[PDB]
Design an enzyme around this catalytic site. Sequence first.
Site, PDB file in Angstrom:
ATOM      1  N   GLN A  63     -29.970 -23.110 -55.333  1.00  0.00           N
ATOM      2  CA  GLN A  63     -29.737 -22.270 -54.172  1.00  0.00           C
ATOM      3  C   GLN A  63     -28.851 -22.985 -53.151  1.00  0.00           C
ATOM      4  O   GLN A  63     -28.398 -22.360 -52.204  1.00  0.00           O
ATOM      5  CB  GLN A  63     -31.053 -21.820 -53.548  1.00  0.00           C
ATOM      6  N   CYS A  88     -34.298 -18.690 -51.762  1.00  0.00           N
ATOM      7  CA  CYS A  88     -35.232 -18.776 -52.863  1.00  0.00           C
ATOM      8  C   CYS A  88     -35.820 -17.399 -53.157  1.00  0.00           C
ATOM      9  O   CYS A  88     -35.984 -17.051 -54.304  1.00  0.00           O
ATOM     10  CB  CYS A  88     -36.300 -19.849 -52.548  1.00  0.00           C
ATOM     11  N   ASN A 127     -37.662 -22.917 -61.411  1.00  0.00           N
ATOM     12  CA  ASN A 127     -37.265 -23.192 -60.043  1.00  0.00           C
ATOM     13  C   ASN A 127     -35.767 -23.001 -59.904  1.00  0.00           C
ATOM     14  O   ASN A 127     -35.026 -22.955 -60.882  1.00  0.00           O
ATOM     15  CB  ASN A 127     -37.679 -24.624 -59.639  1.00  0.00           C
TER      16      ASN A 127
HETATM   17  C1  LIG Z   1     -36.712 -19.689 -49.521  1.00  0.00           C
HETATM   18  O1  LIG Z   1     -35.564 -20.433 -49.782  1.00  0.00           O
HETATM   19  C2  LIG Z   1     -36.623 -18.266 -48.946  1.00  0.00           C
HETATM   20  N1  LIG Z   1     -37.749 -18.234 -47.945  1.00  0.00           N
HETATM   21  C3  LIG Z   1     -38.700 -17.161 -48.259  1.00  0.00           C
HETATM   22  C4  LIG Z   1     -39.956 -17.152 -47.307  1.00  0.00           C
HETATM   23  C5  LIG Z   1     -41.266 -16.789 -48.064  1.00  0.00           C
HETATM   24  C6  LIG Z   1     -41.069 -16.044 -49.367  1.00  0.00           C
HETATM   25  C7  LIG Z   1     -42.157 -15.039 -49.548  1.00  0.00           C
HETATM   26  C8  LIG Z   1     -41.095 -17.093 -50.412  1.00  0.00           C
HETATM   27  N2  LIG Z   1     -39.797 -16.099 -46.273  1.00  0.00           N
HETATM   28  C9  LIG Z   1     -39.508 -16.323 -45.018  1.00  0.00           C
HETATM   29  O2  LIG Z   1     -39.336 -17.454 -44.571  1.00  0.00           O
HETATM   30  O3  LIG Z   1     -39.419 -15.162 -44.287  1.00  0.00           O
HETATM   31  C10 LIG Z   1     -38.379 -15.066 -43.276  1.00  0.00           C
HETATM   32  C11 LIG Z   1     -38.111 -13.616 -42.900  1.00  0.00           C
HETATM   33  C12 LIG Z   1     -39.009 -12.622 -43.301  1.00  0.00           C
HETATM   34  C13 LIG Z   1     -38.744 -11.279 -42.938  1.00  0.00           C
HETATM   35  C14 LIG Z   1     -37.583 -10.898 -42.174  1.00  0.00           C
HETATM   36  C15 LIG Z   1     -36.683 -11.881 -41.766  1.00  0.00           C
HETATM   37  C16 LIG Z   1     -36.959 -13.249 -42.137  1.00  0.00           C
HETATM   38  C17 LIG Z   1     -38.407 -19.576 -47.927  1.00  0.00           C
HETATM   39  C18 LIG Z   1     -37.404 -20.559 -48.489  1.00  0.00           C
HETATM   40  N3  LIG Z   1     -37.909 -21.854 -49.000  1.00  0.00           N
HETATM   41  C19 LIG Z   1     -37.157 -22.951 -48.826  1.00  0.00           C
HETATM   42  O4  LIG Z   1     -36.058 -22.884 -48.226  1.00  0.00           O
HETATM   43  C20 LIG Z   1     -37.687 -24.300 -49.420  1.00  0.00           C
HETATM   44  C21 LIG Z   1     -38.837 -24.875 -48.520  1.00  0.00           C
HETATM   45  C22 LIG Z   1     -39.804 -25.850 -49.188  1.00  0.00           C
HETATM   46  C23 LIG Z   1     -39.381 -27.278 -48.874  1.00  0.00           C
HETATM   47  C24 LIG Z   1     -41.151 -25.553 -48.701  1.00  0.00           C
HETATM   48  N4  LIG Z   1     -36.619 -25.340 -49.513  1.00  0.00           N
HETATM   49  C25 LIG Z   1     -35.680 -25.421 -50.452  1.00  0.00           C
HETATM   50  O5  LIG Z   1     -35.635 -24.619 -51.368  1.00  0.00           O
HETATM   51  O6  LIG Z   1     -34.780 -26.480 -50.260  1.00  0.00           O
HETATM   52  C26 LIG Z   1     -33.468 -26.311 -50.837  1.00  0.00           C
HETATM   53  C27 LIG Z   1     -33.020 -27.562 -51.618  1.00  0.00           C
HETATM   54  C28 LIG Z   1     -31.776 -28.162 -51.340  1.00  0.00           C
HETATM   55  C29 LIG Z   1     -31.356 -29.265 -52.099  1.00  0.00           C
HETATM   56  N5  LIG Z   1     -32.135 -29.742 -53.076  1.00  0.00           N
HETATM   57  C30 LIG Z   1     -33.324 -29.195 -53.361  1.00  0.00           C
HETATM   58  C31 LIG Z   1     -33.802 -28.099 -52.651  1.00  0.00           C
END
Ligand SMILES: *[C@@]1(=O)[C]N([C][C]([C][C]([C])[C])[N]C(=O)O[C]C2=[C][C]=[C][C]=[C]2)[C][C]1[N]C(=O)[C]([C][C]([C])[C])[N]C(=O)O[C]C1=[C][C]=N[C]=[C]1
Length: 215
Positions: A19, A25, A182
């Site tokens: 991503q 995600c 993932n």
């Molecule tokens: C993911 O990328 C998208 N987001 C979704 C989250 C919950 C879902 C049900 C899963 N929703 C949310 O935050 O709601 C916001 C919203 C809702 C309604 C209207 C408007 C806004 C969560 C998010 N997860 C991440 O980004 C993860 C976090 C982990 C560390 C807990 N991090 C990630 O993937 O890091 C990216 C990465 C970069 C480089 N190398 C590895 C990984």
Amino acid sequence: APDSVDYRKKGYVTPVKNQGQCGSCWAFSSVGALEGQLKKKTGKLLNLSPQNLVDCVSENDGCGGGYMTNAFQYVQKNRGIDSEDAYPYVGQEESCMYNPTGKAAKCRGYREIPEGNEKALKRAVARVGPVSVAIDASLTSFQFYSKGVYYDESCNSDNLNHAVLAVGYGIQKGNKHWIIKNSWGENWGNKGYILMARNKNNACGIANLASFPKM
Ligand SMILES: *[C@@]1(=O)[C]N([C][C]([C][C]([C])[C])[N]C(=O)O[C]C2=[C][C]=[C][C]=[C]2)[C][C]1[N]C(=O)[C]([C][C]([C])[C])[N]C(=O)O[C]C1=[C][C]=N[C]=[C]1
């Protein structure tokens, strides 16, 4: 229902993605579920577009985060989602530029799985296939995970922060497990995958927010 299922073998699973520096995600989760229904539907395993979702799903926040339910809903009222080709992923959110001729799939609604029930989840995955799920993924063990059935006692069932894709389940040496896909690269975990503990009291909250599209 079987004691084992893996839709990787049967052919319901595409390659692992990244991503990048975007909170998308929830898109890659939605696309995975949609892809899996396709192969069952029209025998074709195509790679859909997580970016169309990012930009056009107005109910979500794009690189800020969102729900899979909103993403499935959009794929319905807008009557369609593209192939990666027609909307490649650029990990930057941008103004919606959907393309009719791109169209590679559609879904007619979505079903949510009973909150917290892993018995219903095992069934949904055995009968329907790949199911979108959310989990707690803040634990440092999760990021450094490498092999085995993942279990950490600090995983909060009430703090769902990452969306992922469940594509099967089975048992490794007395340890039951969910097979998870993932969106963090193949250089993470076991070639982009992680075996998460099952039946062990909603580990991390894997059965709290799960859904799938209807075709
Ligand atoms: C993911 O990328 C998208 N987001 C979704 C989250 C919950 C879902 C049900 C899963 N929703 C949310 O935050 O709601 C916001 C919203 C809702 C309604 C209207 C408007 C806004 C969560 C998010 N997860 C991440 O980004 C993860 C976090 C982990 C560390 C807990 N991090 C990630 O993937 O890091 C990216 C990465 C970069 C480089 N190398 C590895 C990984």
